[PDB]
Write a protein that binds this ligand. Structure first.
Ligand SMILES: CC(C)(COP(=O)(O)OP(=O)(O)OC[C@H]1O[C@@H](n2cnc3c(N)ncnc32)[C@H](O)[C@@H]1OP(=O)(O)O)[C@@H](O)C(=O)NCCC(=O)NCCS
Ligand SMILES: CC(C)(COP(=O)(O)OP(=O)(O)OC[C@H]1O[C@@H](n2cnc3c(N)ncnc32)[C@H](O)[C@@H]1OP(=O)(O)O)[C@@H](O)C(=O)NCCC(=O)NCCS
Ligand SMILES: CC(C)(COP(=O)(O)OP(=O)(O)OC[C@H]1O[C@@H](n2cnc3c(N)ncnc32)[C@H](O)[C@@H]1OP(=O)(O)O)[C@@H](O)C(=O)NCCC(=O)NCCS
Ligand SMILES: Nc1ncnc2c1ncn2[C@@H]1O[C@H](COP(=O)(O)OP(=O)(O)O)[C@@H](O)[C@H]1O
Ligand SMILES: Nc1ncnc2c1ncn2[C@@H]1O[C@H](COP(=O)(O)OP(=O)(O)O)[C@@H](O)[C@H]1O
Ligand SMILES: Nc1ncnc2c1ncn2[C@@H]1O[C@H](COP(=O)(O)OP(=O)(O)O)[C@@H](O)[C@H]1O
Lengths: 319, 319, 319
């Protein structure tokens, strides 16, 4: 249905000439939102994003193509499926970057209820996807509890200490904080902050965190399914906090938390929690070899919860 | 009158360290608009752009200088002349990039008619340009019909087939589609989409199309005179469609079509045609040699119309 | 209090892979503004900036960290102190970039007076800084007169001529003019232009001016304390004029003037003077050696005033 093509320029690129993952997340979300709004005919905001995995890391000079489609509309929400291809403009070769799902919610104005049409079903796949959407919705809705329950099976005893020869390090020097002011290009015409914009900012903070652990070149491997818990509008300040949670050989998990404050809330210290997300990075050296991250040694009560958290999340993924 | 200077940074650059043509079009249009508004004292939108040819391709590290002036004001419209120079900041050498004309229309608010002053005429050239503007206006106004009539002299018989040894290729794999959401930085303070912004987006889609034919490094040589057919505002989605129309040795023509939809129109499938444009590209290889494009083999009814179209347009240019 | 972290990407970089000084000024100002607004709970605009000196020039691939804090609140204004660190992401090494002060003014809406709380004082330094703020405020307020008085001691006789073998050059070919349209991302949600945005634009014009003198690679060394003389809003055009004022061996002073016009004022030729600033640059050659600038030969009445001006400013700095 909706198709976006973007040539990767220096402006979208990192130090290493690779597409910023955050930039890609923003583009995915924009395409998805437009697919939702083509179905709904009103403005739509990002409700949640499913697990997204990146199969390639696109480079300056290549062209990204993003296709998004409404697979099913429920009451106020719809599931959007997204496919991202990359094409090399010298060899003409195309590769799959990512296949993903995002959920959008229609935001009518202002006291009118919205009536979402039935999505048109033509091919076999259209009908299969329409069923699968109800299943995928169940996973979305049970996700918080699934994790919360796995956490009950983890130790909760903070006595874990690695040997001196293990070479474990603390995560303390990998914490990162940043802040962004939400401006009119960051929000739709009703002033609601784009979810893609939040994701792009998230990822940029998170990558710095990964960098402070390996001192190499991180690239994003995946982001876990997460929910936008509440609205953000123009004028908000979004405060980002990220830290490494755990390592698993060639993977590191960085968690990031996003809090919103309007000008008043900002002075009064009381913000809203917009979302939290968990990003897995790999990293390469200058000879392009995969880096093995050190073992992590949790110290604080928070350190430990996040060490177990990354584990619970990893096991939920592998399944 | 109005002067803009821009140092070319990585942010404005392509993969090859060259100024994005689309970025240059946006800058030209901004300077021109400011010249129009300095004369009109109200907000002004891009009505049309004349043929624009690029004599050099500027590079990261050089400085662009753009001078625009109102040459003549009519009733609601005025002709703006633009000159673009590039300076190399290591050798100090300046070169002409482009000499161009654009027409702007005053958009008063909201029920008041606008009274355009007579442009001040001082030098010989001021008086010559004032006359030439009336002529150039005639060419602008007769342009659609001039083309439409040349098309009557072309074959209209779709039987054209190149030999197998000719090595002609179809244009099918060079089509490109993209989409842009119009946000507040993309429009003036009355919400009207900048024409320069549309041009920048146009060119970025078009260059991808040229790339899919040669698998090299395109650079823009010219854009044909074209008209903005109707307004666009914040909240519109602009859908771009581009394809190669024809080749002429070292030149390829890419056409691009721009349709606007507000949120309602977007869901109801009924958009407005904003403009269509036709861009000529050259391309270089990695040893910096001009590429010769393959011969084009039209297949569909559309293929043929655009094959003839590029010819009609080329002949109108050469004259 | 307020912490911003930014990884330096190609998008923020110059031709030479170095962070744009203007980009850094924008980031400093944003962080500072957020510190002011965290204290005031209303929107705050940049009133003035103190002397700022840059100790390092950060590069693509490094991470900037900016910490800003309210040191003292007066009646409507507050002093903000800022510290900028840079971290190399390969060696993990951190270096001080800059320590600075900026003054913000609360802009309540619209007929309500603002009541600024007393800043909380905890550490020794908190109490020292609170006193020092009253002193630093005195320097801010006496700055225009201090300069004006030094100028009385300078020659005012325009007879200064350097020998032919001195190799002095005129500044005439280093003047630069540019223009920027103020758009919604350039202003807070009340439409007031960000001071940081003006600074970023200032610096980009000024660096071109330095470039036209040495034909090398300028990097910003410092900006003098200056005042924003009046408000700017969305829709303004900001006209920048810059020229080299004087040279002092490895330093060159570039002055820049900023005038604002709304659409009406723009057509009627009557603008507002927003600020003027004076920036000192060094420059390196391609083998990374410091460039020695030529001696400057003033010619016009303006040339001479600015030659003396740069001197007065230099002496005020050294003290
Ligand atoms: C998403 C949101 C609307 C749902 O909030 P809520 O308090 O749970 O309200 P409800 O439980 O009544 O759910 C409303 C709809 O959202 C859906 N929803 C709730 N949680 C979801 C999740 N984790 N994943 C997918 N859909 C979800 C529900 O299925 C429901 O769909 P339906 O109306 O078609 O049946 C709300 O959390 C929100 O506004 N989030 C922020 C949206 C936003 O502003 N995004 C831009 C970035 S800030
Ligand atoms: C340009 C526009 C105002 C003229 O539309 P129109 O339906 O042809 O109306 P008119 O025929 O009455 O022409 C109005 C004026 O535009 C001029 N005009 C029309 N077509 C033109 C063209 N191809 N080139 C130059 N000027 C043109 C006319 O000469 C006339 O000038 P005048 O009033 O000084 O004598 C209209 O097409 C439009 O709004 N285009 C979009 C403008 C815009 O929003 N640009 C931003 C990018 S979307
Ligand atoms: C800064 C500004 C508010 C002060 O203007 P003014 O005509 O001098 O008015 P006042 O003399 O009554 O001063 C008002 C306050 O600004 C302070 N102020 C004035 N000049 C100052 C300077 N050079 N440095 C620091 N503070 C200054 C005063 O100390 C006073 O503080 P207080 O109320 O807490 O005691 C005014 O110049 C302005 O609006 N500047 C533009 C602000 C702006 O829009 N910035 C964004 C970029 S355009
Ligand atoms: N104060 C902080 N400093 C650094 N990183 C943080 C901080 N708070 C949260 N984070 C990161 O954001 C993630 C999400 O935070 P949160 O939603 O509070 O859940 P949890 O701490 O249980 O993981 C954390 O896992 C962590 O990686
Ligand atoms: N569906 C499409 N797919 C790819 N490119 C297109 C498409 N439609 C239009 N274009 C490009 O945009 C140009 C302008 O289109 P249009 O105004 O419809 O005129 P025409 O098709 O007669 O040239 C076309 O020449 C073509 O190059
Ligand atoms: N017309 C101009 N052309 C080029 N540069 C200018 C021009 N006007 C001002 N500038 C630069 O801006 C600076 C500030 O200008 P202004 O506030 O008028 O003070 P002064 O001219 O006394 O220094 C000048 O020092 C100069 O370097």
């Amino acid at each position: 249905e909706v198709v976006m093509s973007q040539a990767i320029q220096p402006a979208h690129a990192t130090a290493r000439g690779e597409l910023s993952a955050g930039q890609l997340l923003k583009w995915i979300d924009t395409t998805a939102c437009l697919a939702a709004e083509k179905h709904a005919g009103v403005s739509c905001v990002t409700a949640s994003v499913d697990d997204i995995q990146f199969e390639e890391t696109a480079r300056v000079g290549q062209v990204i193509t993003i296709k998004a489609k409404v697979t099913r509309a429920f009451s106020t929400s719809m599931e959007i499926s997204i496919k991202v291809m990359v094409q090399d403009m010298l060899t003409g070769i195309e590769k799959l970057v990512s296949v993903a799902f995002s959920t959008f919610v229609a935001k009518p104005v202002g006291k009118e209820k919205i009536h979402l049409k039935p999505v048109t079903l033509l091919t076999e796949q259209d009908h299969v996807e329409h069923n699968l959407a109800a299943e995928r919705r169940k996973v979305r809705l049970q996700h918080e509890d699934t994790f919360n329950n796995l956490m009950k099976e983890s130790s909760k005893f903070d006595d874990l200490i690695f040997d001196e020869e293990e070479g474990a390090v603390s995560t303390r020097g990998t914490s990162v904080q940043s802040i962004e002011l939400v401006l009119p290009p960051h929000a739709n015409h009703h002033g609601n902050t784009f979810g893609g914009q939040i994701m792009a900012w998230m990822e940029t903070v998170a990558t710095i965190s990964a960098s402070r652990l390996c001192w190499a070149h991180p690239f994003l491997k995946s982001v876990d399914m997460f929910k936008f818990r509440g609205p953000s509008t123009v004028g908000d300040r979004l405060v980002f906090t990220a830290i490494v949670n755990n390592t698993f050989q060639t993977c590191v998990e960085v968690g990031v938390r996003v809090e919103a404050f309007d000008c008043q809330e900002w002075a009064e210290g009381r913000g809203r929690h917009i979302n939290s997300a968990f990003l897995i990075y790999n990293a390469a050296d200058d000879k392009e070899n995969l880096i093995t991250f050190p073992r992590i040694q949790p110290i604080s009560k928070d350190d430990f919860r996040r060490y177990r958290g990354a584990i619970a999340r990893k096991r939920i993924r592998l399944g």
